[PDB]
Amino acid sequence: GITKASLATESFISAASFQETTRVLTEAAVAGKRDELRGLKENVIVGRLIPAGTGYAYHQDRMRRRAAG
Amino acid sequence: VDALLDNGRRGRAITGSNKRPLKSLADMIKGKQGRFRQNLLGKRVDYSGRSVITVGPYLRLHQCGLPKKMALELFKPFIYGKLELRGLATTIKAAKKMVEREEAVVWDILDEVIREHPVLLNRAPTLHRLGIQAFEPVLIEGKAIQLHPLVCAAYNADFDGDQMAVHVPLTLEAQLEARALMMSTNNILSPANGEPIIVPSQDVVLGLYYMTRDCVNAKGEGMVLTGPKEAERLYRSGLASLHARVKVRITEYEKDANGELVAKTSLKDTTVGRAILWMIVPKGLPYSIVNQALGKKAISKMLNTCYRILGLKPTVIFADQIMYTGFAYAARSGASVGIDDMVIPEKKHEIISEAEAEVAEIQEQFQSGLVTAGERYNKVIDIWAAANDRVSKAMMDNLQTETVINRDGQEEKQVSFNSIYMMADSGARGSAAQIRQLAGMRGLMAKPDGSIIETPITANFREGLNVLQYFISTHGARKGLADTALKTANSGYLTRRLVDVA
Amino acid sequence: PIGDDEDSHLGDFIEDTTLELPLDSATTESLRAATHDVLAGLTAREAKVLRMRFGIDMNTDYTLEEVGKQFDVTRERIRQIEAKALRKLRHPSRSEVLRSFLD
Amino acid sequence: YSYTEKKRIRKDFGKRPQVLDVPYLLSIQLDSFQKFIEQDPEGQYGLEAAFRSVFPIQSYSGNSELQYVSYRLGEPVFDVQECQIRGVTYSAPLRVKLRLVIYEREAPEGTVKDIKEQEVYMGEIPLMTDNGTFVINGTERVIVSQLHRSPGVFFDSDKGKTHSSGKVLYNARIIPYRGSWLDFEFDPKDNLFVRIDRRRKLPATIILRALNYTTEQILDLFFEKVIFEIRDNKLQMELVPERLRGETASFDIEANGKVYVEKGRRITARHIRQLEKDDVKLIEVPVEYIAGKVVAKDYIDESTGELICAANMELSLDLLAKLSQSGHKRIETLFTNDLDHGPYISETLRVDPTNDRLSALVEIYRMMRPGEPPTREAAESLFENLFFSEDRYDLSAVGRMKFNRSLLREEIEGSGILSKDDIIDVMKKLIDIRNGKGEVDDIDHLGNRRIRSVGEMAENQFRVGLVRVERAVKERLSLGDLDTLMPQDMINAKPISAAVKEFFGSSQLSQFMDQNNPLSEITHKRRISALGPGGLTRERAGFEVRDVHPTHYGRVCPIETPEGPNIGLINSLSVYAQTNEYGFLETPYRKVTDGVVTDEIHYLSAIEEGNYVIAQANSNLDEEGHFVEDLVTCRSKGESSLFSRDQVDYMDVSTQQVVSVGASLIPFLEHDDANRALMGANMQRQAVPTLRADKPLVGTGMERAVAVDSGVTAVAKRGGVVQYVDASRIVIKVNEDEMYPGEAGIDIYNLTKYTRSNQNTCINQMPCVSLGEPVERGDVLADGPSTDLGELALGQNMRVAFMPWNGYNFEDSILVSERVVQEDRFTTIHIQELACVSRDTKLGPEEITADIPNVGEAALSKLDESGIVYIGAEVTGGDILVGKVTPKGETQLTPEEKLLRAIFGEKASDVKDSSLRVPNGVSGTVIDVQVFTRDGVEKDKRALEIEEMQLKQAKKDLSEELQILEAGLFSRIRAVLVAGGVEAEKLDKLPRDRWLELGLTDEEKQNQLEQLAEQYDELKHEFEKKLEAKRRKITQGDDLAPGVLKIVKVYLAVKRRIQPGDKMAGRHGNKGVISKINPIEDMPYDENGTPVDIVLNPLGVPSRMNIGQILETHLGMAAKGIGDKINAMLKQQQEVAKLREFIQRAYDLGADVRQKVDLSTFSDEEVMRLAENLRKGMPIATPVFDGAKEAEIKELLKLGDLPTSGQIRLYDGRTGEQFERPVTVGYMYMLKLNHLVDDKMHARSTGSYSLVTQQPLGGKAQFGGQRFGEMEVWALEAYGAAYTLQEMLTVKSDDVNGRTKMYKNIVDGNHQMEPGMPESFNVLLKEIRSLGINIELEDE
C-alpha cells in the first residue's frame, strides 16, 4: 500500500521527516546507516540543489564523479 | 537523564512552577503538527509579501499588477544598487535615505529593475504545480494585487477576498527558472491531462456565446457582405444586429500542405457576430470552429485545436484576444438577471396536485391495509420523485425553447434568449440543477440518518420557503459545508501519502 | 505557549537584536572603498600617517609617539601633518564623498 | 406610536400579527451575573452558595473552627470610563465577615473565645456593565454562555462500530456537576461492567459489594425467585402462569388432575390463560429440570454445619440429592429468561474476582491509585469520598432533577450525593434497556443539553479559589496559638483574586467583545459554546453534535453558526429564546384551548415540547382565530406533517422565532439558500461603521430592536422636554408624573465622543434630537455609530446594476463609481492607540525628553518642549509622536569611522533614539494623549500641562452639573410656592439663595418644600466631595509594571475612504472585492441620465442561489421610487394635502397588511417632517418568513412610476450607445466589512530574524516574510526549478551567511548565491549529537 511502501526509504534523513522521528533515528543509528542523499526530500532538508530539474545537471555530474576515479 | 533526552517515556517531569511538561531534546528534534521538521510545515522567507487580489482584465496573460509600495519594499536592495550604479546616490546610506524619502527619481529606477525581472505569485491552497506561477510585474497605484483572469482557474482563486503571496526570484538562475518554467505562458496545459487550463471562465464565455448565436429575425437578415470587416462595420453602425442569419465571404487557411498554409475563400452561411469574431482567429484554423454557438466546451476546443496546429505563441495571443473580446462583447450585450428571468412552469401546481393525489391513494391503501408500511413508503417516495422529475422537465422545456418569434410569417420558435438560460447553457455559470432549484421545486431532503423525507420541498427559491422547509434545508447546508471542508483535508492527506510514496 | 494553541511558542518570537542588519553591512563595506579612495588622495606620507594614527587596514592603532619613532620625524611634527591632512579633506571636493556618510 | 417614529416610519409588509414582541436581547448576560453577585438568603446560586458550600472550615479534630458570616461588595475604585482610560479593571472589592471560634478543649461544645474579624478582604471581583460587558484591562470583554451535557444520568447505545458482530452494546453514564464520573457498560458476553471516570474496567457487582451487599442480596436485588418444593418426595414447583411466556415445554406440564400442556408444545397465550383461569399455583416437575437452574441464597447442612452450595451456583442432579437429604424443603432459584428477564448480573458475578466488601474496596482502591499498597482506611476513605461525600461530589439541582426524572422518580429535588438506591436504580434501568423495555437517550437533544452563563462559571472559578484557601486555613489552624491570630493572617488575597483574574483575563470563553458594530456586540453577547471547560473539543466530537437537531427549533438559530474548524459548536441564541429555570432552553408558544388560538403565551422547554402537537407560525386563522383549513402543517415529535384541525395543542408565537437576530436582519431570507444565508449573517457582523450612518432602505423591522437594546445608542431614562442639546451632552427636563418628589430633577446625558473601539474603529455618538423637543420615555436621544434615527444601519444602500462591465466584475468583483468615493459615504474612521514606554536599563533610565540625537527642526517641530505631540496635529508615517531616548554608551567604533569623526569633529552621543513613531503608511489626526507616571516620580512639563487642563475641565464639568441641577430644583420650588401663597413678580425679585426661608400654609406642600431643601443641600455637598475625588484621581500616579518609569499613549484617528482591494458585501452572502474605481463619466446610466453607483455581476446570482439579493434590489428600487416622487413633491412645495395623500397611499398598498396609519398625527408640522425624512427613500420592512410578495413589489413599483420588470434601459457612459437587453437596476443595502486592504497588505525585503533558529521574523510590526511550506516546495519540485527552491530555503531565509553575502551581490548588480548550509539542519545536527547519537558529514 502507498502508506506502507513509503516506509522504506534508503535515506534516513528523508524517513525522519514524514515518519515517527524518534524510531527512525534510533533504528538507523544502530545499523550505522550511511545516507548518501540522492533523493529530493533529503536534499531539501539538508538545503542543497534538488537532484532533479535544473539541479539534475549538477547531481548527475557529481553522481558519476562518485564511485569512480 | 531520561527526562533530558526523551521525556514522557517514564514520568513526564514538569517544569518549575509551571504545570505544562518540559520540552526535551527528543521533542526538540520531532517538532509538532504531526511530522513537520521546519523544512516541512514551512519556513519563513525574505523578499516576499502578499495582499488582497483584484481582476485586471487589461493585462496580457504573461503579466500581473503589482502594487507600487510593495514593489519598492520587495526590490529595495536592487533599487539601492541600481540607484548608486547610475550615480544618483553617493553611497548606499544615501540610497536608503532617498527611497525612504520616496524621491521622484526612484520610481524610474524601480521601473528599470522591474522590467525583465519576473515575480512568483502563489495562493493559499497550493495543490498542483500551477499553484505557483511566474509573472512579469506591472507597477500599479493601489494596495491590491492584480491577477490575469484566465489564471483564476488554475489558482482556484475567487475574488471574494482571497489573498496572494509574492516572492521575488533573486539569483539569475531563479529568474531564468521562473521565466522558462514557472512562467504563465509556458504552462497553458494541465499536467494531469493535455487539455488547456487557460480555458475562458465565465463572463468571457457568455460574451463569445452571446456573440455567435442566432435569433430568427434581426436587422440585416439575409443580406450579404464582402468580409468580416464590413460585417463588424455593419454591426457597430447599428444597421445590422449582432445575431442574424447572413451569407458572408470569408478567407480561411489550411496548413495541410507540407509545413505550408493553403488559402481558400468562400461564401459561408453564418451570422454577423461569428463574422466579427472570425477576425481574431489566427491563420490555419477553418471557419468551421467559429460558426457554431460557442459554448464553454467548444470555446475550449477552439483553443486546443489552435495549439495543436499553430504552436504556442499564436495560441497564447489567441487566448488573450478571446478574453478581451469576450469581456467587451459581454459588456455590450447588457446581460442581467431579474426576478422575471426565472420562469416557473404554468403546469407546476397541477403536477403538484396529481402527485399529491397519488400519496392519498397509497395512504388510503395503508388505511385499508392493502399495502404494508414500508412498501407504502417506497411508493410515496417514488411518486414524489417522479413529480420532481416532471416539474424539472417542464420548467426546462418552458425555459429553453419558449421564445416564439415571427419571421415574415406568423410564428416560429427557437432556443430562448432569456438571460439565466444563456448563462446556464453557455457553461458560464449556473446549471440545470441550480436553475431547477430556482424555478422548479427543490428535491427531497433527508434526515442525518439518511432516511429520505416523504414530504419534499414543494416551494422553490423564486417563491418563498416557509419555516419548516427552510429548517429542513439547513441540515443539508451544514452537512454540505462540513463534508466539503472535510474532503479538503482528506485530499491533502491523500496527496501527502502520494508524494511520500513517489 | 501563546495564542491559537498552535506551534507559536514564546521562544519563537524572540528576535536576535545582536545581529547587524545587512542594510548597514553594505555601508560598512562601502565606507572602506570610500575612505580608501580618499586616502589615495593625500601625499603618500600623509596617507601613511593618517592610516597609522587610526587602525585603517592595520593591526590595532598607533600612539603618535610610536608614529614618530617609525617615521624618524617625531613628536609635534606628526600632529601638525595630520592636522593639515584633515584640512585637505575638510573642504569639499574631497569632502562631498565622506560627508554623505555622517547621518 | 412613539416620537421618533413620527420622524420616520418604516413601511411594513407581512400579514401575521405579532402576539409577542421581541424581548431584551441582552437578557441572558445580565441575568446570569445578576444571580452570581447578589445576596440570596438560601442555597440558590450566588457568592452566598459557594460560600456555604466550602464553609464552615474546621481544623482537623482540633476544634478550631472558622465560620462564614456575611459578605459585601465595596464601591468600584474607578468607574467604567476612568477604568477604560487608565486600563485597570472595573471591579469591586470583596469584603467578607469571618468568625473564628475556638472550642474549649474537652468540651461539651462551648467557646473559649470567638473573635469576629470584621470583613477580611479577599480578591477584587470584576463587574458587568449595563451592556453585559466586563472591562479587564481598559477593554470591554464578554463571557460567552456555555452549552454542555447536563448533569444527571444518561443512557446510550454505541451500536454498529463496536466489534462488528452487531448486537449493539448498552451503556449508562452518571455525570455530576463536580466529582468523578460513574460509568456502566455491557460487553459482547453480556457481562455488566463498571468504570470510574475513563479508568480501568471492573465487573459491575464489585461496586455493589463496596456498598455492603453480599452475593445473596445482589441476586435478591436483580432477579425474581423461582420456588422449588420437595413435598412428599420428588420435585414440585411454584408457578406464576406468566413465567411460561416465550418458552417451550421441557416436559409434561400438568397439575390439578388435568394436563394443561404436553412436551414439545410451545406455551402460548392460550395455555397461559388456561393456567390463569384454572389457577394452578403448584405443579410437579422432574428432578432433571433444575440441572440448569441457578440457586439464589446460600445453603448449608443444618447438622454438619457445612456449605452445601454457595449463592449463585448452577445446581446439578447430584447436588439436589445432597441438599435434599439434609432436610431442605425449599430451594430458591433465579428467574432467568434470555428474552424477557436476562441473566446478566449472575454472569457478572461469575467474573467477579472478589467476595466481601473489604475485598471489593481493595480492588477499587488499587484501581484508582494503582501499585501502592492498599489499606483498609485508605480504601474506605477513597470510596466514601468519591460519590458519597458532600465535599468532593455534587450533581446539584439540575443534576439531581434530570437524574430523578430520567429514573422515572417522583421527587424533583434531592441530595447532591448518590445513594445505594440511586446507583442500584441506574443499574436497574440499564439492565431494563438491555431487556427490551425502555429506550436510549441521544446527546444532541437539547433536553440533555444545558446552558451555563457568566455567573455560573465565575461562581465555579471562585469556588476553586475557596477550596485552595480552605487547604490553607486548615493548614494554619493546625498548630495555632489561641487569641493572637485572627481571620486575616491565614486568608490571603492573591489566590482568590488571581482565581477570578485568570478566568476573566484569559479563557477560551472570555474574550474581547467584538465591537466593530452594534450587531456584532449584541450577537456576541447572545452566543453559545460547547467548547472550553466541561465541554468537548473540535478534534474530539464529530458531526452529530454539530449537526442541527429538531430540538434547535426556537432555541438555537439553525442558520447562524461559524463556517470554520468549529461548525455548530457555537451556533447562536434564537430571538425569542430564554434560559430555563433549571438552565435549559425554552421558547415562547401560543396555547390552543379547545378550538381557539389563545393569545396567552407559554414557554416550553425541549422536553416539555416533546409530546404536544405544535402548529405553525404561518397558518391561516381568522375572526375568532379558528384554523381556516381542516388540516394544517405542524410538528409534533421530532418531525413535521399535516395535522388534523383540532388536534394541535399550541402554535408558534412569531414567524421569526426559528432564527436569530443576525438572520432576522436578512430581507427576503426565505428566497436564499441556507449556505449563503449562513455566510450572509456571518459577514453582517463584520461590517465596519460608516462615516454617515445611513439606514437600510430594505429592512426587516428587527434593526430598531438591535439599535436600542445594544448600548451603542443613548436612550431616554425618563420622558420630558429637551432643555439642552450639545454635541457633548443632552439635558432633558422631566415630566412631573414620571418625576420623583425629591431632588426635583432633570436627566443629564453625557454622550460618548470620539474614542477607540476594540477593533480600532471609531465609536462616536451624535444627538438625534433638537433644542426644546418632546421626548417620550424610552426614546432614542442620540445615535451610536452605525445607527440612524433609532434603527440599525450597518452600511449604506446604493444604486446597483446587474450587468457584466468589461470583465472588471469578473468573479465576485465589484466595480464602483467615483461618485461614491467622492461622497465619502463608505469612508471609515479608525482610532488607534499607540504607546511609548519609558523603561529602566542597567545603562540608565530612558528619557521622554524632546532632545533627540539626529533629527531636523521639522522633526522636533510637531513636539512640544516635553517631547509629546500636540493634540490635533495631523501625522503620517515616520512622524514622531513621542520623543524617547535610552542610554547606550561607548559605541566602540572602528578605524575608518574614527577617521571620519576626526575629520568631521562630531561627538557621537551616549544616547540612542527609541522614540515612538507612527507605523509606516498609516496617517491620521491626534485626538488625545495620556501620561501614566509611577507614583512618586516627578511629572514632566507636558504631563503637568495635561494634568492642569484635566483639572480645569473637571471643575468646569462638575460646576455645570451642579448649576443645571440647582436651577432645575429652584424652578420646582418656585412652582410649589405659587400654590398656597403665590407671589408672581414678588418672589423672583429677592435673591434665590434666600428662597428656602419662605414657608407655606399648613399642608403637605410645606413637607415638599422640606424635601427639596434636604435634597438641595445633599447635591450641594455631593458636588464638593465629587470634585475632591476627581482631583485626587487625576493627580495620583497610576500603578505601573516593573522597570517602567512612565508611559505615553497617543490616540490617532485615521480616515480611510475606500480603495481597490477592500471587501464589500450584501446581507445575502454575496462577497466582493472592489476592483476599479470608475469615473462617473464611464458609468452606465439610464434615460434620465442618472448614473449607477455600483455595477455587480449577474453570473454570481444563479450559481450560489440567493435570489433575495435580487428581490432586495427590486423592492429597493421601488422604495427609492417612493422617495423620488416625494422628493419632487416637496421640491414642488405643493401643500400638506397632496403629500399627506401620497404618503397615505404608499402606507396602504393594495390589501391585507398589518401596518395601520396616520391622520391621528398633526397635519402640518409632524407630517412635513415625516416626508422630509422619507425623501431619501422610503424605508421598507420585510419580516423574516412573513416578508413581501412579488405582486406587492410590482404594485409598489406602479406607485413609483417605475416598470414591473425592475429592469430599465441603460447606456454605456463611454460610447453613449444603448445596451442591448434591459438590465436590473435597484437599491441594494451594502456593507463594508473590515478586511480593508491597507491592513491586509504586507511586504518584506530584509527584516529582523529569530534568535533560537535564524529565520525571518517581524519585531517592529515590520512583517516577517511569507511562509514557504511543504506543498509550495512540491510545486517548486514539479517545475524543474532547483535554484529558486534552494534560494527559497537557504539564502532567502535560513542561511545566516547566505542572506548577507546575497544582499551585497544584489546591490552590487551580481545575481548569484553562495548558499552554505541552512541553520535549521545545522541546529538539528547538534540536537541529534546532543544525544548519544553521533551524526557526521562524510567524504568530500
Ligand SMILES: Fc1ccc(-c2n[nH]cc2-c2ccc(NCCN3CCNCC3)c(C(F)(F)F)c2)cc1
Ligand atoms: F423543525 C422541524 C421541521 C421539520 C422537520 C422534519 N420534517 N420531516 C422530517 C424531519 C426531520 C427528522 C430528523 C432530523 N434529524 C435527526 C433527529 N433524529 C431524532 C433523534 N436524534 C437523531 C435522529 C431532522 C433535522 F432537522 F435534523 F434535519 C428533520 C423537523 C423539525
Ligand SMILES: [Mg+2]
Ligand atoms: Mg473563495
